[PDB]
């Protein structure tokens, strides 16, 4: 039935190594600040535009600037201006920098930075002080040994025999920070169409120096994603009737096995 | 396991102790052992008639130890 896919840690490490080219190689989701699904939803709902993100028609019609006439709390001659509040500074704190922020989903504050020194050479040991990590400056009322603090001859560290490093130890510690399919070790075999291999690329910020066409394409893809996300009505409770299994139960259908090319040619002939 | 008695707070402090046979002593705890054997430096035992006799530092076993009362601040 192909319902569960639980592989060993080295198998998943080899799979991630063979597929690291298509993976974004991120650690902390904080790198997508003000560029997540919640941020896009808040931007669309506020009739604003995140520069790296899409823009849609306003959810609620907004009156013109002249609709108000120099109200006591709206007088330009009283507001001190230091820096212009951009659309990012409003989509980030919707409740403080946007009057009437109706239906404005907030965004998560900065998660702690994932300071994970990724491996670069298999020769080096697993738990080694890499040069990337800043050095620790080595500069305790320890009791004297004149007492009788003697341990039994059977007292030993719990993992004295177990080494502090292993061949799969560094690789295993690498898979902790990885894209979701690599992060897990047991999953369900999803549908082929239900596994977009390029969604993470579009979700990330557009590559630097891209042409206008590429940027517009990325913005349109983000708009489509935000539209499919905001309209994510949970599915209804069906009676679980299988049309294919029903037709199989019907006496007017046979069953066999043939190549996809032959079946495609037969289907083309049948459609003609 | 094999922990000693609570003699760290009462060590070096003048307190009284009750020993078996109706004995009462007063002195400074110079140390303790795991079998209840403690050292009483400058120990004075009070007799039943009322007079007290100073016996100096002595060793008190843990079998006949009734109870100790700290006569100073612990």
């Amino acid at each position: 039935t192909y319902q569960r896919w639980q592989f060993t840690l080295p198998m998943m490490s080899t799979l991630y190594r063979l597929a690291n080219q298509l993976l974004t190689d991120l650690v902390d989701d904080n790198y997508f600040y003000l560029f997540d699904l919640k941020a896009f939803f808040t931007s669309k709902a506020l009739n604003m535009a995140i520069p790296g993100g899409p823009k849609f028609e306003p959810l609620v019609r907004d009156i013109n600037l002249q609709d108000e006439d120099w109200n006591e709390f709206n007088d330009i001659n009283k507001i001190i201006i230091r820096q212009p509040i951009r659309t990012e500074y409003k989509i980030a704190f919707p409740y403080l920098y946007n009057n009437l922020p109706h239906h404005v989903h907030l965004t998560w504050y900065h998660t702690p930075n994932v300071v994970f020194i990724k491996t670069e050479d298999p020769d080096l040991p697993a738990f080694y002080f890499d040069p990337l990590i800043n050095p620790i400056s080595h500069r305790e009322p320890l009791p004297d040994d004149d007492e009788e603090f003697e341990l039994p001859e059977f007292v030993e560290p719990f993992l004295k025999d177990t080494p502090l490093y292993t061949d799969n130890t560094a690789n295993g510690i690498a898979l902790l920070w990885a894209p979701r399919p690599f992060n897990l070790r047991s999953g369900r075999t999803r549908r082929a169409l239900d596994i977009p291999l390029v969604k993470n690329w579009y979700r990330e910020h557009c590559p630097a120096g891209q042409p206008v066409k590429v940027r517009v394409s990325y913005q349109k893809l983000l708009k489509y994603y935000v539209l499919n996300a905001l309209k994510h009505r949970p599915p209804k409770a069906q009676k679980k009737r299988y049309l294919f299994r029903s037709f199989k139960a019907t006496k007017f259908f046979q069953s066999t096995k043939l190549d996809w090319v032959e079946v495609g040619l037969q289907v083309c002939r049948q459609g003609y | 396991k094999a922990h000693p008695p609570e003699l760290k707070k009462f060590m070096d402090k003048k307190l009284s102790l009750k020993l078996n046979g109706g004995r009462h002593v007063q002195g400074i705890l110079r140390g303790f052992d795991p079998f209840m054997n403690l050292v009483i430096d400058e120990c004075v035992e009070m007799a039943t008639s009322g007079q007290q006799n100073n016996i100096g530092m002595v060793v008190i076993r843990g079998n006949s130890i009734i109870m100790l009362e700290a006569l100073e601040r612990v």
Partner: protein
């Protein structure tokens, strides 16, 4: 930190005449010069004598073996 075992070992090595009180019986104790001690509190007292405080009598027995359970407290003596 002077423990009781080290003080008992020093009193056994010094050969001084020490007095031990009976456990649960303070009317009669022992007095003598202990030459050594054991792990179960039994010591070898040389010239040991049983002194009863009720009658004021002293009965000497010589080299005796004092058990650790019969002796409750032990103090220092001049003689």
């Amino acid at each position: 930190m002077v423990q009781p075992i080290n003080l008992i070992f020093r009193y056994l090595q010094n050969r001084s005449r020490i007095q031990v009180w009976l456990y649960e019986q303070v009317n009669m104790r022992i007095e003598g010069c202990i030459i050594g001690f054991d792990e179960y509190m039994n010591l070898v007292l040389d010239d040991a004598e049983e002194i009863h405080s009720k009658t004021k009598s002293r009965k000497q027995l010589g080299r005796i073996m004092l058990k650790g359970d019969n002796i409750t407290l032990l103090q220092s003596v001049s003689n």
